[PDB]
């Protein structure tokens, strides 16, 4: 999956909701849940471009009214190879 | 790809128009023609998400004025593994 979808939320409950929605909506792989600090959890998915578009939309919708909310939802269709080095490859 | 696009029409002629259109328009494979009963024929395509969207749009545009009409054009991007058991694998 070339594309990247990312949702940042304030708190983990909103992020889990986002991840769930994203993975259900389209065919995407959750490659990371990242605890940023300060209460930011970023959930990241990879899939083909149309999938990541639908997943992100879905996740965003899901997460907005759960908890403290959504900080950001972003789709990056091809990411520079350099960026790949800072992107999680499987969740841990 | 695993997306599903389904077009239901009233009668078979609209549905063949839809199938034709879908398959020509985007890179999607036709997986079924189902006679639902009551004159509802469902034509189903599987492809990647962008392809499915495009195909279904094209097909609906094609079949709306053909025969008795279009009943539904719908895209489900990732289908639960269970629903797959009720979806035709190849067109037989």
């Amino acid at each position: 999956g070339i594309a990247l979808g990312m949702i940042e939320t304030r708190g983990l409950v909103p992020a889990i909701e986002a991840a769930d929605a994203m993975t259900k909506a389209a065919e995407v792989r959750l490659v990371g849940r990242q605890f940023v600090g300060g209460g930011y959890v970023t959930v990241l998915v990879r899939g083909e471009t149309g999938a990541v578009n639908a997943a992100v939309r879905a996740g965003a919708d899901a997460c907005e009214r759960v908890g403290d909310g959504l900080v950001a939802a972003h789709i990056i269709a091809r990411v520079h190879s350099e960026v790949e080095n800072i992107l999680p490859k499987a969740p841990q | 790809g695993i997306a599903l696009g389904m077009i239901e029409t009233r009668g078979l002629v609209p549905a063949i128009e839809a199938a034709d259109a879908m398959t020509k328009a985007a890179e999607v494979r036709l997986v079924g023609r189902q006679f639902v009963g009551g004159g509802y024929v469902t034509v189903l395509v599987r492809g990647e998400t962008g392809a499915v969207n495009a195909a279904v749009r094209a097909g609906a545009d094609a079949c709306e004025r053909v025969g008795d009409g279009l009943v539904a054009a719908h895209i489900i991007a990732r289908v639960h593994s269970e629903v797959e058991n009720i979806l035709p694998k190849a067109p037989q």
């Binding site: 639908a54 879905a58 | 969207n53 489900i76 991007a77």
Partner: peptide
């Protein structure tokens, strides 16, 4: 089902 709908 789209991202948007969802004689």
């Amino acid at each position: 089902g789209t991202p948007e709908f969802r004689l």
